[PDB]
Amino acid sequence: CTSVIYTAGDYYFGRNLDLEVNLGQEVVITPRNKTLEFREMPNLEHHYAIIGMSIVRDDYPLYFDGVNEKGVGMAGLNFDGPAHYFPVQEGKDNIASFELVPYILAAASSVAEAKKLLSNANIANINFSDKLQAAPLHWIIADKTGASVTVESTAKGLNVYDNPVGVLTNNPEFPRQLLNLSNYRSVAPANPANVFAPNVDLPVYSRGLGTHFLPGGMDSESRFVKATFTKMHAPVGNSEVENITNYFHILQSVEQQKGLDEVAPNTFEYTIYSDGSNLKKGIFYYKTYENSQINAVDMHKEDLEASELITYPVQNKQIINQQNH
Amino acid sequence: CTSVIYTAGDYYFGRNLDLEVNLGQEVVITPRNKTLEFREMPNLEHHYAIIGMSIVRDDYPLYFDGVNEKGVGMAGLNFDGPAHYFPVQEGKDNIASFELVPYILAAASSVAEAKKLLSNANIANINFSDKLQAAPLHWIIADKTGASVTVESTAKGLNVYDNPVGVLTNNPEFPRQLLNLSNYRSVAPANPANVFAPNVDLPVYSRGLGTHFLPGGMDSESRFVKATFTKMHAPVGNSEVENITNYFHILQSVEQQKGLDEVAPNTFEYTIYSDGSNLKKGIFYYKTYENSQINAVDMHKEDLEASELITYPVQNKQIINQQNH
Amino acid sequence: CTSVIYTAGDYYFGRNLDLEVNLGQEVVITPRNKTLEFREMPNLEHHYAIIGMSIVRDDYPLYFDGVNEKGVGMAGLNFDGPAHYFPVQEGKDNIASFELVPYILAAASSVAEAKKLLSNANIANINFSDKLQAAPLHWIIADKTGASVTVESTAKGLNVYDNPVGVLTNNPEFPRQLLNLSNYRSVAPANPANVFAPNVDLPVYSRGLGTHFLPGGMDSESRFVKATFTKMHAPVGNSEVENITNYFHILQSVEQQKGLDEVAPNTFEYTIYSDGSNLKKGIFYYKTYENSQINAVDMHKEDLEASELITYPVQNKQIINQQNH
Amino acid sequence: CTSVIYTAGDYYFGRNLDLEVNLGQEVVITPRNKTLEFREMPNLEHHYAIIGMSIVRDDYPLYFDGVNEKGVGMAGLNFDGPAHYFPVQEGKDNIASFELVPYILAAASSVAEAKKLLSNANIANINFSDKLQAAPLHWIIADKTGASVTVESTAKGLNVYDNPVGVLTNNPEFPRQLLNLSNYRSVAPANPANVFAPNVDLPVYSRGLGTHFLPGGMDSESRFVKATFTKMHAPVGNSEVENITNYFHILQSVEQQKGLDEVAPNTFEYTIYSDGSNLKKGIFYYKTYENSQINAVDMHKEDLEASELITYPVQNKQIINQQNH
């Protein structure tokens, strides 16, 4: 998985979900008056409206990622190994891993408020059910000011790190992942000057040599570096349509194609979907691996004062424009 | 630019066109009875039908790439530096660089026949006009048997190389480009065994480490390696729609996003379009940078006995499916 | 800097010292009855004999690295950034950074005993003097059983990590440095099988392609990977002379040549000396950058019951064998 | 193998010889009046004096490399695959592969003269004997002006290329090897500015990050890049002793340690010797893998008017300075 905030125009947040099987994901709008229950905290009877990619069990929106009406975005990304959840702790705001995205998107109007909400929190080892055990995750939170943080619960406890690049992938822990970027300081979009052998003619035989050492692997560190470079050098678009076009090109740079990331015999981790939302306008856009046409769900076309989840199925059939006849 | 033959199903051939400006490209069908004039060879009054991406000047189809009705595909890719064209030579079949794609697609029913057509050929330094000077190019030819060759005219003369990987990008010359793949023999989709320090626990902290050293740069060598890996490990799809979906994912792996390959101030080489055709059925598919929906032009829905070029404009507006209302 | 334990024969421990200036280093033997004073712990009036590379101030052996008569080796390596020393703490064994190598080598007969000695320790922010301020360091301890640990005092406190590779360089912190080795699992001394494009002839045009992705940079991460590979694949020598020959070849693989690691204008970090000792026999061997002949100081040829430091100057003139006359 | 000219002081030329077995190499001086026989050219009864590393069969100096009294150096390096020798050709100066180094060093007073001597030459497929078949080689020639060329006989014929970097290793052919350096234009001794994410703090956590992408592998391309960087950034020494010290540090950067380059089970290509000569003074220096002390053979201490080969055995026992007693 790879999640980014693209800081152009209204600003755009979302993620690639990389996995070897589909999950039953659908587009879910949680309206302001849908009651959100929590295992160790008060229920939220009224809260911010949410739109995102989710599964639904027992009428609960188990979000993979989403954005709320106040311009806050959040995504949960696989974190298998470092992730550690703790027993319920007296005097701490105890949040199950499956509750964290619904809770923050319901309650926080900014990254700054999300930090306050997490300042006395504990990610508790609470399973949704016997069928759905807690999965190892970490999270990125971003908002329409451009701010973002990385939330990791590990053996050390709960850490909320400023995220200066607005990117997150999988392992390792965030300080290690961020430090690795320093190894790539010399990589650039423009052709490098010859500092290797300055008094020797070393012909520039190809365009693009500025990115000769840019990683293109399927692994988590490679994708973190390549996605950071791609988002940091993305254009400033003119329109909203240009900006969402540019956004998906960022995510596409670290898409995992089928066949390239083998996790078991005949089994490959690939980008099952890519989504991104306009943070100011609450428009959710997504593509699936099987359909290249972008789909848009505008949360404000719905009844955000409703009290039941509103859902749409992901359009996963390739829609080809038959241009001639 | 990157061109590939994807050897699944009916087999699929095409290219990314990477450039810093649009060219006026359109989809062009050359029917069997469109007369094709040649500067130093007999006119072809009747020939195979062609579909591809082209510009048109003086009613001549200046193809960037295309396929013909017999399942032969061909693409011209920038080759600035090594490319050399020669004066017209007595006793040689003299072909202008701008004529080579129209000529081979009109006259050859296989890569094998294309080899015979080139066995006494000379790529002549003939300009289309004073406005359109000859550009430095090399070419890949592929067919529905899976065969392919790389055609390069350099200071050494005209070389036609067997292409064992069915891929071509830009510089350097093909033997050098092919040899470079040997440096990547150890890169694989599956997780590598620990041969680095076999008696030490080196945890597999991420999926995808098989491709940790896979290049992700924008330059010609990086894209050649990454595209070869991606096509060599692409799935065998079930349907025609799955196969064209898989095909564009191959090309997408080496797409050049805006902002990453700077060629002059504020000027970036990016993938202006991607196309790919079913070699058996003569269906041409394409995307533009600005539109993620795939477009299809079926050559057999046209009058292939016509005598005038048939053209369609590239659909370059992002077509977003507005899912809710 | 790079420190290694070479697990062949009697076993051999030492380090490259990489710096941009000389330090006044000399070879120092601390005999059993040289009193070693400590700022916050009892003096050691009798202890194990030590030999190593050191400077001497106020008749105190400020060791960079050394080994003791019981087969324990220890080295202090620059750790600028992560290193943090704490105020003196009640109820903790408080050890100044400049005391740690003299103390462990004087008091510990094994890595296991060194772990016990550090189990309630605090690396205190105590300067040797106003002229010699505390420098940021971390340490490797190894012994003749092959065991080794990495000692780091950071903002987290004092950590003593099992060191499964018997190597240490500079930044970053040890868990991050060790995790990075997992990225190199596929690198090997033998030629790799073609898993990149298995059905394509990719000729093995050079020997040594197993190490094509082995780092050769001057930076701390590059040297950690290359030194680990080189020591892990070093031969098992026949004699003691062959083993010390093999040992220096390990250190030489990550030597920093003058001109390659620029730290300020005209200023280069280079390997000012390399040393290594037979852990069982207490023989200290060293080379300087300016002299390629190995020099040996056998600690047991000295009076190890003495009470004063015994010193030898480093032989830093190139001794060339004039073979003909 | 790796051969370099180090352009400091009097200038210094030589090579690492990398192989999996010893060859019986000795130091050989060919005096001016030693008759040199040639299979297809006139004998040289009088010629320039030569010193170098060689084997001797039938009183013929089969040089691996050497320098002559006029400041010309030459080395033969393995070139298995591209190397092609031709039948004896009428009207060409036909030179056996085993004769080329003795011939050029005997007859040429500069690289420019060596070019003239090769302008009508053919490297003929002539074996020294049935026991010593012709081995595949290419060659570097350098002189005390700093000039150098690369000599390759391949399927294309005989090519003599200007060598702008004064380095040669093994495969591939020289234009490909030289072009590969352009991929490393951004590698430098100084710390790189942050062009990757310019508005983000990417801490410089280690010195030496300028060379983070510098290759450290055992293969021919890796060693070519690393040796070129190391020689191009070597210091300008003060004395002759400093210069020969600096020279061996250049060769040491691409030494192949035992255990790292496996060519068959239990069989490793390693640097059996390293040599380098003062081009102006005709002093030959060498080390063996087993002996770190530099050895010097001054050709002018010999009778250069003699008519028989003068030989010295390589000092291959480690000479350790026993500093204490």
Q: With both helix axes pointing from N to C terminus, report the angle between C100-107 and C111-118 in degrees, rounded to the nearest 10.
A: 120
Reduce the DSSP state of residue A75 to 3 states and report it: strand
* Residue A52, token pair as written in the block: 């995102």
* Residue A81, token pair as written in the block: 């190994």
Whether the link from the prior residue into C172 is cis, omega within 30° of 0, is yes
What phi and psi, each to the nearest 5 degrees, are found at residue D182?
-60, -25
CATH of domain C2-313: 3.60.60.10
Pick the closest to residue D296 from D285, D287, D288 (CA basis).
D285
Pick the closest to residue A172 from A121, A108, A224 (CA basis).
A224
CA dist., res. D182 & res. D26, Å (int): 38
Q: C179 vs A176: CB contact, 8 Å cut-off?
A: yes
DSSP A177-244: HHHHGGGGTT--SSPPP--SSTTS-----STTGGGTT-B--SSHHHHHHHHHHHHHT----SSHHHHH
**Phi-psi sector, D59: left (phi>0), alpha (psi -120 to 50), beta:** left
Report the gap between the CA of A166 and the closest CA in chain B (Å).
18
Q: How far apart are the first and last CA of chain C?
A: 40
Pick the closest to residue D120 from D145, D144, D92, D98 (CA basis).
D92
Reduce the DSSP state of residue D20 to 3 states and report it: coil
CA dist., res. B26 & res. A112, Å (int): 50
Question: In terms of CA atoms, which chain C residue is nearest residue A156?
Answer: C156
CA dist., res. D208 & res. C221, Å (int): 10
Pick the closest to residue A280 from A36, A7, A2, A3 (CA basis).
A7
Q: C200 vs B164: CB contact, 8 Å cut-off?
A: yes
Report DSSP state, residue B184. G
Residues with Cβ < 8 Å from D142, sequence gap 6 or more?
D5, D13, D72, D73, D74, D111, D148, D163, D166, D279
Any idea of the CA torsion for C115, C116, C121, C123, to the nearest 10 degrees?
A: -30
Question: In terms of CA atoms, which chain C residue is nearest residue B229?
Answer: C196
Residue in the structure block whose two tokens are 């949410």:
A50
Give me the residue from A205, A210, A228 closest to D197, CB to CB. A228
CA dist., res. D213 & res. A213, Å (int): 8
> Distance between alpha carbon B309 and the CA centroid of its chain, in Å?
22
Torsion sign over Cα C232, C235, C239, C240: negative
Q: Which residues of B touch A261 (CB under 8 A)?
A: 189, 207-208, 210-211
Residue in the structure block whose two tokens are 């702790």:
A89
Question: In terms of CA atoms, which chain B residue is nearest residue C204?
Answer: B182
Q: How many CA atoms lie less than 13 Å away from A99 in the CB half-sphere?
A: 26
Q: How many CA atoms lie less than 13 Å away from B14 in the CB half-sphere?
A: 30
Pairing of strands A321-322, A310-313: unpaired
Contact A26, A55 (CB under 8 A): yes
Which of D260, D267, D312 to substitute to test the interface with C, most C CBs within 10 Å? D260
Q: A202 vs D181: CB contact, 8 Å cut-off?
A: yes
* Residue B174, token pair as written in the block: 């093909």
* Residue B213, token pair as written in the block: 């050293």
Experimental technique of record:
X-ray
Contact B202, C181 (CB under 8 A): yes
Give me the residue from B208, B216, B324 closest to A298, CB to CB. B324
CA dist., res. C298 & res. A255, Å (int): 60
Reduce the DSSP state of residue C197 to 3 states and report it: coil
How many CB pairs lie under 8 A apart between chains A and C? 9
Pairing of strands A26-30, A50-57: antiparallel
Q: Which chains touch B (3 or more CB pairs under 8 A)?
A: A, C, D
Which of A260, A263, A285 to substitute to test the interface with B, most B CBs within 10 Å? A260
CA dist., res. D291 & res. C151, Å (int): 35
User: Do you know the residue count of chain D?
Assistant: 325
CA dist., res. D46 & res. D31, Å (int): 9
CA dist., res. A230 & res. D264, Å (int): 43
Q: What angle do CA C106, C112, C114 make, to 5 degrees?
A: 35
Report DSSP state, residue C184. G
- The residues with which D26 forms a beta bridge, in sequence order, are D54, D313
At B308, the amino acid letter reads E
Taking the CB of residue D91, how many other CB atoms lie within 10 A of it? Answer: 7
Residue in the structure block whose two tokens are 């010629």:
D47
Q: D260 vs C285: CB contact, 8 Å cut-off?
A: no
Q: A228 vs D165: CB contact, 8 Å cut-off?
A: no
Report the gap between the CA of D178 and the closest CA in chain B (Å).
12
Secondary structure of C92-115 in HEC code, one letter for each residue: CEEEEHHHHHHHHHHHCCCHHHHH
Q: With both helix axes pointing from N to C terminus, report the angle between B240-252 and B220-232 in degrees, rounded to the nearest 10.
A: 150
Q: C221 vs A176: CB contact, 8 Å cut-off?
A: no
CA dist., res. C213 & res. C194, Å (int): 15
H or E element that contains D27: strand D26-30
**Rg (alpha carbons) of chain A, rounded to whole number:** 20
Residues of C with catalytic function: 1
At B165, the amino acid letter reads V
Pick the closest to residue D109 from D66, D150, D139, D73 (CA basis).
D73
DSSP A255-282: ---TTSSEEETTEE-EEEEEEEEETTTT
- The residues with which C160 forms a beta bridge, in sequence order, are C151
At A103, the amino acid letter reads Y
Report DSSP state, residue B193. P
Q: How far apart are the first and last CA of chain A?
A: 40
**Rg (alpha carbons) of chain B, rounded to whole number:** 20
H or E element that contains B118: helix B111-118
Taking the CB of residue D190, how many other CB atoms lie within 10 A of it? Answer: 16
> Distance between alpha carbon A120 and the CA centroid of its chain, in Å?
24
User: Do you know the residue count of chain A?
Assistant: 325
DSSP D166-220: -EE-SSS-HHHHHHHGGGGTT--SSPPP--SSTTS-----STTGGGTT-B--SSH
Q: Which residues of C touch B147 (CB under 8 A)?
A: none
- Name the E strands within chain C: 2-6, 12-19, 26-30, 50-57, 60-68, 72-78, 93-96, 121-124, 137-143, 148-154, 157-162, 167-168, 262-264, 267-268, 270-278, 283-288, 291-298, 310-313, 321-322
CA dist., res. C32 & res. C299, Å (int): 11
CA dist., res. B114 & res. B102, Å (int): 12
Burial of D131 (0-12, 13-18, 19+ CB in 10 A): exposed
DSSP B246-307: HHHHHHHTT---TTSSEEETTEE-EEEEEEEEETTTTEEEEEETTEEEEEEEEGGGS-TT-S
- The residues with which B36 forms a beta bridge, in sequence order, are B44
Q: With both helix axes pointing from N to C terminus, report the angle between C240-252 and C220-232 in degrees, rounded to the nearest 10.
A: 150
* Residue D301, token pair as written in the block: 């201490």
Contact B288, A295 (CB under 8 A): no
Report DSSP state, residue C81. T
Q: Which residues of C touch B202 (CB under 8 A)?
A: 181-182, 185
**Phi-psi sector, D92: left (phi>0), alpha (psi -120 to 50), beta:** beta
Query: What are the C-alpha distances in Å from C276 to residues A42, B64, C252, C287?
Result: 64, 64, 12, 9
Residues with Cβ < 8 Å from D88, sequence gap 6 or more?
D40, D94, D122, D124, D126
Give me the residue from D182, D196, D229 closest to A184, CB to CB. D196
Contact B88, B126 (CB under 8 A): yes
CA dist., res. D34 & res. D36, Å (int): 6
Which of B165, B167, B186, B236 to substitute to test the interface with C, most C CBs within 10 Å? B186
Pick the closest to residue B279 from B165, B151, B146, B150 (CA basis).
B146
Contact A84, A155 (CB under 8 A): yes
CA dist., res. D279 & res. D68, Å (int): 8
Helices then strands, counting H and E runs in chain C, come out as 5, 19
At D178, the amino acid letter reads L
Query: What are the C-alpha distances in Å from A25 to residues A22, A275, A316, B321, D212?
Result: 7, 12, 11, 18, 42
Question: In terms of CA atoms, which chain A residue is nearest residue B228?
Answer: A260
Which of D174, D178, D179, D220 to substitute to test the interface with B, most B CBs within 10 Å? D179
Q: How far apart are the first and last CA of chain D?
A: 40
Contact B73, B143 (CB under 8 A): yes
- The residues with which C275 forms a beta bridge, in sequence order, are C15, C286
> Distance between alpha carbon D93 and the CA centroid of its chain, in Å?
24
Give me the residue from C188, C201, C203 closest to B195, CB to CB. C188
Report the gap between the CA of A182 and the closest CA in chain D (Å).
5
* Residue A35, token pair as written in the block: 């009651």
Q: How far apart are the first and last CA of chain B?
A: 40
Residue in the structure block whose two tokens are 């010593």:
D132
Reduce the DSSP state of residue B203 to 3 states and report it: coil
H or E element that contains A74: strand A72-78
* Residue C320, token pair as written in the block: 């060339």
Give me the residue from C190, C200, C213 closest to B165, CB to CB. C200
Report the gap between the CA of A223 and the closest CA in chain D (Å).
15
Q: Which residues of C touch A (CB under 8 A)?
A: 172, 176, 179, 183, 221
Contact A39, A294 (CB under 8 A): no
Residues with Cβ < 8 Å from A145, sequence gap 6 or more?
A71, A110, A111
Any idea of the CA torsion for A150, A151, A157, A162, to the nearest 10 degrees?
A: 30
Residue ranges of the alpha helices (H) in chain A?
A: 100-107, 111-118, 174-180, 220-232, 240-252
CA dist., res. B141 & res. B76, Å (int): 9
Q: Which residues of A touch C (CB under 8 A)?
A: 172, 176, 179, 183, 221
- Structure's resolution in angstroms: 1.7
What phi and psi, each to the nearest 5 degrees, are found at residue D299?
-65, -30
Residues with Cβ < 8 Å from C250, sequence gap 6 or more?
C4, C6, C227, C230, C231, C234, D257
Give me the residue from C189, C191, C222 closest to D212, CB to CB. C222
Residues with Cβ < 8 Å from B119, sequence gap 6 or more?
none
* Residue A72, token pair as written in the block: 């806050």
CA dist., res. B191 & res. B210, Å (int): 5
**Phi-psi sector, A223: left (phi>0), alpha (psi -120 to 50), beta:** alpha
Contact A253, A227 (CB under 8 A): yes
Q: With both helix axes pointing from N to C terminus, report the angle between D100-107 and D111-118 in degrees, rounded to the nearest 10.
A: 120
Residue in the structure block whose two tokens are 């196969």:
B243
